[PDB]
Paper text:
Protein gradients play a central role in the spatial organization of cells, but the mechanisms of their formation are incompletely understood. This study analyzes the determinants responsible for establishing bipolar gradients of the ATPase [name], a key regulator of division site placement in [name]. [name] dynamically interacts with the polar ParB-parS complexes, forming a subcellular gradient with concentration maxima at the tips of the cell and a minimum at the cell center. It inhibits polymerization of the tubulin homolog FtsZ into the so-called Z ring, a structure that forms the basis of the bacterial divison apparatus (Erickson et al., 2010). [name] belongs to the Mrp/MinD family of P loop ATPases, a heterogeneous group of proteins that act as nucleotide-dependent molecular switches (Leipe et al., 2002).
Numbering used by the authors:
A (entry chain B): 4 to 273, 280 to 287
B (entry chain A): 2 to 146, 152 to 273, 279 to 287
The structure:
């Protein structure tokens, strides 16, 4: 694996939280990692790493940082430019990432856009964060269990389909691995448990993805965001927030998440520096 | 590089699809081509049965009219519908190979939905023909509103284009949606319907041509396996009327939009007028 695309149809589902945690995990494993954020208007992942750089500079602390590549001098402005200019910016950034880094992580916003399609076309691994609800699963398609046939494809699944096509047309013979990461919801109703399980399994089979565990929504992530820090950075020497058992829980979820992506052996580790910081 | 493989399909099977398919077949026959017909609606087989009816009627009479090479996938295609996918695929491949060896045009009537054989038929298409009734609800079969929701039928065509390109065929596949005007259509909706189909055409990658109005005359000809082009003073097991001449004119415009005018028999004593 070198190109990892984190994508879903409508954003959310902790996508950038997952993206930036994958980045720091791979950095701690000793890789050179590039990060490209194709959510040009919101730039959640790119801003996270801008915060990391600023905070580290302010504290004169060193932690691993990625090569963060913008598409232009002003990516918020680029969002309103014609597609061809967004594509050009992406191609130049991607060229630099491939020349300089071992892993390239691309955080992508979904929609019907050239750059999202092109990013998925470069992906060795597509990571799709998905909340555990019926309305969210609709973004992957609709499969009968009237038969188990596809009845309605989704826009996002078409994006992935288009990516696999670009990849093959380009002469890359290795298959792209597509993992939907299911985020469990605190609100999930008992009446829906069996059908939620069965629906996602039916979609996995017909649409062509496999299922892994995501991250539960937690306020701890938004509290870390302004510092550009991930769970893996926290220690007695690095704790601008109180470290709690929430952080240790999140760390375990990330272990299982990374395992499902096939990336365990590339991560930093997961004495215990996080427990030490409690 | 000339059109050889024509795949007629839609999502739900209505919209005069079999009527259109069999009229394309006889037009191309009258134009001097050998034509194969393969019907992948395995349970209903409307087009296959049309040509079985034709054979039976011509045999009963002592009459020669052109007939296609009508190829089944098995000894019992209705039974085949319930068999494992790989058996359907095998039957399709064997039929298609025979058609390609023996015929100039191959017309495949397909039911859509999510089957290997419908995908494979589209993968072999030079021209995809999609009969579609003129309404907002019908157009949803092609997708929705940028694109927000793709449709299964449109994905099947896109998949076909991909298979074609993967096979080393560099010529593009042509895809025409044939818009059947409805008698129920109110005049006030004309522009809204037009704008909707044009937006879908642009994003989904099809072009639009005119279809065939629903008419009782087709149901009346079906038992005899006859199309408009067959009717004459010598061939009229139904009373010929101005409806049949109207249908003939519709077929002309349809065939023209498909790029098939120069291959048709003739959509000189007007034999249809003579039969009135």
């Amino acid at each position: 694996t070198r190109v990892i695309v984190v994508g879903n149809e409508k954003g959310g589902a902790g996508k950038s939280t997952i993206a930036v945690h994958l980045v720091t995990a791979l950095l701690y494993g000793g890789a050179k990692v590039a990060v490209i954020d194709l959510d040009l208007r919101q730039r959640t992942s790119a801003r996270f790493f801008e915060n990391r750089r600023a905070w580290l500079d302010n504290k004169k602390i060193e932690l691993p940082e990625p090569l963060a590549l913008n598409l232009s001098d002003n990516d918020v402005a680029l969002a309103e430019r014609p597609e061809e200019e967004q594509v050009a910016g992406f191609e130049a950034a991607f060229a630099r990432a491939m020349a300089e880094c071992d892993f390239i992580l691309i955080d992508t916003p979904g929609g019907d856009s050239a750059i999202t399609r092109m990013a998925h076309g470069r992906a060795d691994l597509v990571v799709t964060p998905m909340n555990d609800s019926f309305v969210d699963f609709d973004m992957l398609g609709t499969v009968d269990p009237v038969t188990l046939e596809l009845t309605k494809p989704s826009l996002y699944s078409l994006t992935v389909w288009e990516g696999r096509k670009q990849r093959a047309l380009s002469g890359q013979r290795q298959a792209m691995d597509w993992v939907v990461l299911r985020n469990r919801l605190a609100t999930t109703e008992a009446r829906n448990r069996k059908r939620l399980e069965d629906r996602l399994n039916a979609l996995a089979k017909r649409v062509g993805f496999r299922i892994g565990p995501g991250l539960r929504d937690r306020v701890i992530y938004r509290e870390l965001f302004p510092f550009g820090l991930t769970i893996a950075d926290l220690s007695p020497q690095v704790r601008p927030v109180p470290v709690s058992l929430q952080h240790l829980a999140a760390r375990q979820e990330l272990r299982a998440l990374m395992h499902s992506l096939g990336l365990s052996a590339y991560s930093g580790e997961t004495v215990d520096k996080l427990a030490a910081a409690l």
